[PDB]
Design a protein around this ligand. Sequence first.
Ligand SMILES: c1cn(CCCCCCn2ccnc2)cn1
Ligand SMILES: [Zn+2]
Ligand SMILES: [Zn+2]
Lengths: 128, 128
Amino acid sequence: AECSVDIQGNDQMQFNTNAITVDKSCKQFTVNLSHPGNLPKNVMGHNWVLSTAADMQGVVTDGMASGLDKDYLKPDDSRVIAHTKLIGSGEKDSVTFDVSKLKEGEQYMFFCTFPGGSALMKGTLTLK
Amino acid sequence: AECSVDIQGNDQMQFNTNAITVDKSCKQFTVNLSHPGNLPKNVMGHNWVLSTAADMQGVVTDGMASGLDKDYLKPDDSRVIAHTKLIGSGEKDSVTFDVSKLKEGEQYMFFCTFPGGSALMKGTLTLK
Ligand SMILES: c1cn(CCCCCCn2ccnc2)cn1
Ligand SMILES: [Zn+2]
Ligand SMILES: [Zn+2]
């Protein structure tokens, strides 16, 4: 199954992968985010958020400053290329987005925007 | 056993108590901190740290800005009345301090200074 990827965030602040490759010839791409482990959303929440490498920092800072009610994202943060809901243990969220929103030779980062000082629940994303 | 208290911080960011009362007639007071649950120091670290209510904020901010090597405390933070080591799952640390360092009618706060989730692992402590 190209044009999708299953990804997990555990009670350890770990994504089960840190490099996503998106196939140049997908019209759309889907991220299937789950949470094993036993910790609730308010303690060990994870979302999967996509931005350019450059924007990641800003998106995170403004995101944490948005609070739990906003899934730790700034409302209408135009830097956020795509994102899932914030999930807790045993929950499950998907996000599909147009691959046309991605550009060749750019660094993208995926990450979780839930609080933790110097991080980071992060990973790279890239076309191919 | 007055003049001491056993206190736990779990994989949930929860101290097992949030109000400590120090007996006016103890010469010294002892806090026995332990960590049930399974998560390592670098994920779910807990220390027990005591300051005035006033100082708590600055101590926490400068503490998180100190990093894991410094047990998330500012070196020689003179606002820190007493503190334990930072511990992970299965670990155990105690701290004794002079009750003379406490003053009647003042709000004191105990807290973990590890970089948090939704809000802070707080509690109160009072002379009586
Ligand atoms: C993934 C992990 N996180 C942070 C999980 C919080 C861990 C809290 C540990 N802690 C906080 C205060 N004392 C101990 C955000 N997204
Ligand atoms: Zn997370
Ligand atoms: Zn802690």
